[PDB]
Paper text:
Here, we report the crystal structure of the kindlin-3 PH domain together with molecular dynamics-based and biophysical characterisation of its inositol phosphate lipid-binding properties. Similar to that of kindlin-1 and -2, the PH domain of kindlin-3 contains an additional C-terminal amphipathic helix extension, which is not present in other PH domains. A salt bridge in the kindlin-1 PH domain (Arg380–Glu416) has been shown to occlude its canonical phosphoinositol-binding site, and in the kindlin-3 PH domain, this salt bridge is replaced by a hydrogen bond (Arg360–Gln396) in the equivalent position. The kindlin-3 PH domain has a mixed surface charge distribution with a pronounced concentration of positive charge at the canonical inositol phosphate-binding site. The kindlin-3 PH domain is closest in structure to the PH domain of kindlin-2 (RMSD = 0.69 Å), with the major conformational difference being in the β1–β2 loop. The PH domains of kindlins-3 and -2 have similar surface charge distribution to the PH domains with canonical inositol phosphate-binding sites, indicating that inositol phosphate might interact in a canonical way through the β1–β2 loop. In particular, the β1–β2 loop is flexible with both simulation force fields, in good agreement with the crystal structure. MD simulation revealed that kindlin-3 PH domain interacts with the PIP lipids primarily via the loop connecting the β1 and β2 strands, and that it has a somewhat higher affinity for binding PtdIns(3,4,5)P3 than for PtdIns(4,5)P2 in a membrane-like system. Moreover, one kindlin-3 PH domain appears to bind multiple inositol phosphate lipids, at both canonical and non-canonical sites, by means of which the affinity of interaction between the PH domain and the membrane is greatly enhanced by an avidity effect.
The later identification of the kindlin family of proteins revealed them to be key co-activators of integrins, alongside talin. Talin and kindlin interact directly with the cytoplasmic tails of integrin β-subunits, with kindlin binding to a membrane-distal NPxY motif and talin binding to a membrane-proximal NPxY motif. Kindlin-1 is expressed in the epithelial cells of the skin and gut, kindlin-2 is widely expressed but most notably in striated and smooth muscle, and kindlin-3 is expressed particularly in haematopoietic tissues but also in endothelial cells. In any case, membrane binding by kindlins is thus not only an important factor in integrin activation, but may also determine their cell signalling impact and even the cell's fate. The membrane-binding capacity of kindlins has been proved to be essential for integrin activation and is dependent on their PH domains and on a long loop within the F1 FERM subdomain that is conserved and similar to an equivalent loop in talin.
Numbering used by the authors: 345 to 477
Write the structure that this text describes.
Amino acid sequence: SLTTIPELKDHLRIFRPRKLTLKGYRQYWVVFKDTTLSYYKSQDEAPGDPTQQLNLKGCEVVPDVNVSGQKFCIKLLVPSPEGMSEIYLRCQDEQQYAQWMAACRLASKGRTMADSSYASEVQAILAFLSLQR
């Protein structure tokens, strides 16, 4: 009948290396559903004007972490028919990094946030971060 699917929605800071127009980290409104990440400039522009969307299934997920430096970065390496796209996500705190990273790591494997091991994945990441500090 009625079902409910989990999503992530928040503002993240994003950098795109190989976009040959100059642009560093911008705060965008970013939404994660199923195994696809979509980022937008503004909330009003959600959901049907995607500045960028990408299916993370099959991609490389590179953690880029320095807890003492308040660096919570996720590097997504997405293959394409014309080479690799890179998408760098910077989160605001440890909780946000844990949710967003758990989601990216599962999605890379084709598993969604509905998979029963997503919660233990978040909590596992939080533990990781908390013990480094």
